[PDB]
């Protein structure tokens, strides 16, 4: 399986590990030199919360597995039962997760009140609709 290329993480059962077996719907041979730093997997994006940087519903998001991210970076973050993709603004014991769409509102997370962890760092996008 290690030589099948990047796993494609499709739909994601609430509270479940991102790379759980039952989530990997595909695999694509993608050059490792393509993304910096290296992609470890591809995450299908949902919704249009990031359309303004061109990360559209349906796009495959190259994600580098790490918990080491900075403010200003597009993170993949787990909040209680959910996983989202946003620009990170950390601020004391309050973490903001910023959309790239004016129709969307920043998610504001209280670290005392909710489990918040970083799943990885978005390093690239692959779009492969049948119609562009």
């Amino acid at each position, epitope marked *: 399986e290690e030589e099948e290329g990047l796993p494609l993480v499709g739909r994601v059962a609430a509270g479940e590990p991102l790379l759980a077996q039952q989530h990997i719907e595909g695999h694509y041979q993608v050059d490792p030199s393509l993304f910096k730093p290296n992609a470890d997997f591809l995450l299908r994006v949902s919704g249009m919360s990031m359309k303004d940087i061109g990360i559209m519903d349906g796009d495959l998001l190259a994600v580098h597995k790490t918990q080491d991210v900075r403010n200003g970076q597009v993170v993949v973050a787990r909040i209680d039962d959910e996983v989202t993709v946003k620009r990170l603004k*950390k601020q004391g014991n309050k973490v903001e997760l910023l959309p790239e769409n004016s129709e969307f509102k920043p998610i504001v997370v209280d*670290l005392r009140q909710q*489990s918040f962890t970083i799943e990885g760092l978005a390093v690239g996008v692959i779009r492969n609709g049948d119609w562009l």
Partner: nanobody
Amino acid sequence: QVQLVESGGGVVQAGGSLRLSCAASGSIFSSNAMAWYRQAPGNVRRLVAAISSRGDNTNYEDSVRGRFTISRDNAENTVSLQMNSLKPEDTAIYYCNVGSFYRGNYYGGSSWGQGTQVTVSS
């Protein structure tokens, strides 16, 4: 309906030792990677250590590597954090997590215990 319970926390002097334990109840334990996270005051919760389902592989946060070891006991449904050379940096709520390993890396899910407080002082 997985239920996790951390224990073993307390107050410890710098350079000392301490052992955390987690009891997992509503799961098929042999089938899951287990991990320890920690959350220090006003900071993002980070993974400290993880172990694959049968313990073949582990992960460690760089700053606890060589100081902390994780292990699990499949007969007893527990996972444990042996903490040596405690620094003040180590002060946090420690949480037990259920997750899964893929290509040598722990990916976690959203089940947590209530947490156990570790405080390092002099």
